[PDB]
Design an enzyme around this catalytic site. Structure first.
Site, mmCIF file in Angstrom:
data_model
loop_
_atom_site.group_PDB
_atom_site.id
_atom_site.type_symbol
_atom_site.label_atom_id
_atom_site.label_comp_id
_atom_site.label_asym_id
_atom_site.label_seq_id
_atom_site.Cartn_x
_atom_site.Cartn_y
_atom_site.Cartn_z
ATOM 1 N N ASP A 91 35.018 -65.642 -39.635
ATOM 2 C CA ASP A 91 34.990 -65.261 -41.043
ATOM 3 C C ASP A 91 33.584 -64.975 -41.555
ATOM 4 O O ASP A 91 33.445 -64.317 -42.587
ATOM 5 C CB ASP A 91 35.586 -66.381 -41.888
ATOM 6 C CG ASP A 91 37.058 -66.556 -41.660
ATOM 7 O OD1 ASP A 91 37.710 -65.562 -41.243
ATOM 8 O OD2 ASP A 91 37.578 -67.654 -41.946
ATOM 9 N N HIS A 135 44.603 -78.879 -32.091
ATOM 10 C CA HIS A 135 43.368 -78.306 -31.560
ATOM 11 C C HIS A 135 42.673 -79.263 -30.605
ATOM 12 O O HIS A 135 41.464 -79.120 -30.336
ATOM 13 C CB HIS A 135 42.441 -77.890 -32.685
ATOM 14 C CG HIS A 135 42.179 -78.982 -33.664
ATOM 15 N ND1 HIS A 135 43.074 -79.297 -34.666
ATOM 16 C CD2 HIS A 135 41.165 -79.872 -33.756
ATOM 17 C CE1 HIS A 135 42.607 -80.327 -35.355
ATOM 18 N NE2 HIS A 135 41.454 -80.697 -34.818
ATOM 19 N N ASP A 137 42.932 -82.972 -30.436
ATOM 20 C CA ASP A 137 42.672 -84.383 -30.691
ATOM 21 C C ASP A 137 43.878 -85.141 -31.207
ATOM 22 O O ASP A 137 43.751 -86.340 -31.517
ATOM 23 C CB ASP A 137 41.508 -84.545 -31.676
ATOM 24 C CG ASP A 137 41.733 -83.825 -33.028
ATOM 25 O OD1 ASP A 137 42.865 -83.405 -33.313
ATOM 26 O OD2 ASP A 137 40.753 -83.712 -33.796
ATOM 27 N N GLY A 143 47.621 -75.257 -41.353
ATOM 28 C CA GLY A 143 47.718 -73.931 -41.912
ATOM 29 C C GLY A 143 46.875 -73.785 -43.168
ATOM 30 O O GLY A 143 46.050 -74.627 -43.500
ATOM 31 N N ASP A 161 32.475 -86.531 -34.389
ATOM 32 C CA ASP A 161 32.734 -85.098 -34.339
ATOM 33 C C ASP A 161 33.300 -84.596 -35.672
ATOM 34 O O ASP A 161 33.795 -85.362 -36.506
ATOM 35 C CB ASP A 161 33.690 -84.728 -33.203
ATOM 36 C CG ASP A 161 33.097 -84.972 -31.802
ATOM 37 O OD1 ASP A 161 31.906 -85.417 -31.689
ATOM 38 O OD2 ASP A 161 33.853 -84.744 -30.815
ATOM 39 N N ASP A 165 39.288 -76.401 -40.253
ATOM 40 C CA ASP A 165 40.568 -75.710 -40.073
ATOM 41 C C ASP A 165 40.333 -74.211 -40.239
ATOM 42 O O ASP A 165 40.071 -73.729 -41.348
ATOM 43 C CB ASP A 165 41.555 -76.246 -41.113
ATOM 44 C CG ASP A 165 42.935 -75.652 -40.981
ATOM 45 O OD1 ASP A 165 43.159 -74.763 -40.136
ATOM 46 O OD2 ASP A 165 43.789 -76.114 -41.742
ATOM 47 N N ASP A 166 40.442 -73.452 -39.147
ATOM 48 C CA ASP A 166 40.152 -72.027 -39.234
ATOM 49 C C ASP A 166 41.343 -71.232 -39.749
ATOM 50 O O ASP A 166 41.273 -69.997 -39.836
ATOM 51 C CB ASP A 166 39.683 -71.505 -37.871
ATOM 52 C CG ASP A 166 38.744 -70.296 -37.991
ATOM 53 O OD1 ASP A 166 38.298 -69.928 -39.105
ATOM 54 O OD2 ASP A 166 38.493 -69.681 -36.939
ATOM 55 N N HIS A 186 30.216 -82.605 -46.589
ATOM 56 C CA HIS A 186 31.136 -83.729 -46.757
ATOM 57 C C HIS A 186 31.536 -84.326 -45.398
ATOM 58 O O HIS A 186 31.464 -85.552 -45.183
ATOM 59 C CB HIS A 186 32.341 -83.219 -47.557
ATOM 60 C CG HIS A 186 33.462 -84.217 -47.656
ATOM 61 N ND1 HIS A 186 33.699 -84.980 -48.787
ATOM 62 C CD2 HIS A 186 34.404 -84.579 -46.749
ATOM 63 C CE1 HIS A 186 34.731 -85.786 -48.568
ATOM 64 N NE2 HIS A 186 35.175 -85.571 -47.339
ATOM 65 N N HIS A 190 31.067 -88.287 -43.247
ATOM 66 C CA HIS A 190 31.870 -89.163 -42.392
ATOM 67 C C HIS A 190 31.229 -89.348 -41.035
ATOM 68 O O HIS A 190 31.302 -90.444 -40.454
ATOM 69 C CB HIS A 190 33.270 -88.579 -42.157
ATOM 70 C CG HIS A 190 34.102 -88.459 -43.393
ATOM 71 N ND1 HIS A 190 34.361 -89.533 -44.229
ATOM 72 C CD2 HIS A 190 34.762 -87.394 -43.922
ATOM 73 C CE1 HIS A 190 35.162 -89.124 -45.210
ATOM 74 N NE2 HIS A 190 35.398 -87.833 -45.055
HETATM 75 CA CA CA Z 1 38.197 -67.062 -37.068
HETATM 76 CA CA CA Z 2 44.605 -76.306 -43.938
HETATM 77 CA CA CA Z 3 30.858 -87.350 -30.637
HETATM 78 ZN ZN ZN Z 4 36.511 -86.652 -46.227
HETATM 79 ZN ZN ZN Z 5 40.364 -82.397 -35.186
#
Ligand code: CA
Ligand code: CA
Ligand code: CA
Ligand code: ZN
Ligand code: ZN
Length: 228
Positions: A91, A135, A137, A143, A161, A165-166, A186, A190
């Site tokens: 994108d 994906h 994990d 979506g 990690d 969400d693509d 953000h 975490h």
């Molecule tokens: Ca893409």
């Molecule tokens: Ca989503």
């Molecule tokens: Ca790691």
């Molecule tokens: Zn969060």
């Molecule tokens: Zn994940």
């Protein structure tokens, strides 16, 4: 609407906490927990504000509890945090994506004793991935809209990690799309060991809100000062 509310309360940890309080059947106790956690009026009702909150795009990390049992004490014990951009959304140009992640790390580096260093291997502390649906994990995305991204607290392997969400349109938040810079800032919170904030203006509040202002607030800075 009741379906959406049941799933939201389950996913983000409210239903489980209500069960541990013997409270357990009716949605009311769980809704109150959610209203307190999101700083909504504490009605215990599936009211307009609460439904509006449940429909708002947000971070997929739970609010109460965690994805799973994790290893270690959930903070880093070295100062140079490495990160690997494993893949890219199409994108935005790769250089814009790289710079969005670098700027998001620069936010945290100024207020922590940590540094962030880009590397090109799975040995990185923070592996950054774009993905869709399942994906790799076992915490699948959903979506377009809904969950935007998630991340895992400091530690080995998947811990630290950050995943985006693509099925979202990634931009810098101007015109169309979600700001990759804001969502990464953000999620990297975490990945350093922060949980969600109940302050609606804070970077670590779970709902997405675009802003052109500086992303960090007092609650975010003091959160990381009360960790490192
Ligand atoms: Ca893409
Ligand atoms: Ca989503
Ligand atoms: Ca790691
Ligand atoms: Zn969060
Ligand atoms: Zn994940």
């Amino acid at each position: 609407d009741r379906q959406l509310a049941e799933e939201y309360l389950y996913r983000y940890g409210y239903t489980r906490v209500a069960e541990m309080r013997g409270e357990s059947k009716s949605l009311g106790p769980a809704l109150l927990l959610l209203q307190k956690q999101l700083s909504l009026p504490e009605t215990g009702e599936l009211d307009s504000a609460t439904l509006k909150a449940m429909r708002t795009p947000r971070c997929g990390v739970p609010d109460l509890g965690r994805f799973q049992t994790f290893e270690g004490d959930l903070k880093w014990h070295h100062h140079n945090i490495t990160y690997w951009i494993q893949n890219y959304s199409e994108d935005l140009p790769r250089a814009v994506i790289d710079d969005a992640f670098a700027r998001a790390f620069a936010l945290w580096s100024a207020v922590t004793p940590l540094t962030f260093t880009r590397v090109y291997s799975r040995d990185a502390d923070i592996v950054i991935q774009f993905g869709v649906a399942e994906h790799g994990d076992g915490y699948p995305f959903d979506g377009k809209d809904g969950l935007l991204a998630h991340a895992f607290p400091p530690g080995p392997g998947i811990q630290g990690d950050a995943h985006f969400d693509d099925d979202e349109l990634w931009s810098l938040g101007k015109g169309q799309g979600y700001s990759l810079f804001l969502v990464a800032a953000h999620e990297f919170g975490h990945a350093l060991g922060l949980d969600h904030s109940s302050v609606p203006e804070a970077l670590m509040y779970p709902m997405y809100r675009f802003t052109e202002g500086p992303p960090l607030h007092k609650d975010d800075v003091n959160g990381i000062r009360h960790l490192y």
